[PDB]
């Protein structure tokens, strides 16, 4: 469960992301496909080459959904109900992959936000991405 300080930490870090959300989302995807190639099995219809426009657009989408989760941190299951439904009933991504994307988003943030990525904020982001993942996989069965 996210504590008050966690929420505060997440809102502040994500705040600094600002207009780079989309770029970071795309970067995290790229890091994931290269570091963890089994994740590519979910995207056979995508051009996965560096700088491809499908990865870019998808990067924006993920990033925006995350922004919405941060804005709705107290009410995630509701704010993300449709995405939760989509992942459970259509996409059907194995849960292990959410941990791989989460780690890659952390590495991306660590690389772009040096001053902001303190040990306490790192802790809070990791918990936040974990709750987001839990919400997106809650209706699987």
């Amino acid at each position: 469960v996210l504590s008050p300080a966690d929420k505060t930490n997440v809102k502040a870090a994500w705040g600094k992301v600002g207009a780079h959300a989309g770029e970071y989302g795309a970067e995290a995807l790229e890091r994931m496909f290269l570091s963890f190639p089994t994740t590519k099995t979910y995207f056979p219809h995508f051009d996965l080459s560096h700088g491809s426009a499908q990865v870019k657009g998808h990067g924006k989408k993920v990033a925006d959904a995350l922004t919405n989760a941060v804005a709705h941190v107290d009410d995630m299951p509701n704010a993300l109900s449709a995405l939760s439904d989509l992942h459970a009933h259509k996409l059907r991504v194995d849960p292990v992959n959410f941990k791989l994307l989460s780690h890659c988003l952390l590495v991306t943030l660590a690389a772009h936000l040096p001053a902001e990525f303190t040990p306490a904020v790192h802790a809070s982001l990791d918990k936040f991405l974990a709750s987001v993942s839990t919400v997106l996989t809650s209706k699987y069965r």
Partner: protein, 146 residues
């Protein structure tokens, strides 16, 4: 895949008692019932909406038989699982796009099916040897992913 001779004997002994066709159908059907996400790969199989619809589906049964047939053949080559499953690995990756985590789920369901069928005879040491084999087969099928 470090199997001791006595583990290898335990694995082979029991396997000689297995009806592969029937066990194959059960393991695949249970995978699709217990982990419904795995149904994403079988939309062409028809009705998979309830447990009886899955378990008795002729296409699930036939696919189960095919899967387990290849698995048996793997038990005849425990010293070279990787070479044995190389072309299947490539196929599952480049053509079927199957996330290898699914091979691990199937392995564990197969282990419950063996326990269900054999009862007592599937002792703790025998399960331990099978856990190593299912992990080795899952690793061999994942080895050509890129």
């Amino acid at each position: 895949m470090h199997l001791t001779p006595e583990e290898k004997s335990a694995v082979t002994a029991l396997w000689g008692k297995v009806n592969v066709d029937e066990v194959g159908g059960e393991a695949l059907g249970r995978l699709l019932v217990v982990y419904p996400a795995t149904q994403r790969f079988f939309e062409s199989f028809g009705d998979l909406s309830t447990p009886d619809a899955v378990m008795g589906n002729p296409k699930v049964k036939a696919h189960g038989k095919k899967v387990l047939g290849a698995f048996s053949d793997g038990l005849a080559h425990l010293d070279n699982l990787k070479g044995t499953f190389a072309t299947l690995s490539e196929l599952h990756c480049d053509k079927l796009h199957v996330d290898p985590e699914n091979f691990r789920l199937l392995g564990n369901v197969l282990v419950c099916v063996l326990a269900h069928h054999f009862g007592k005879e599937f002792t703790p040491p025998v399960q331990a040897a099978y856990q190593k084999v299912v992990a080795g087969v899952a690793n061999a099928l994942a080895h050509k992913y890129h």
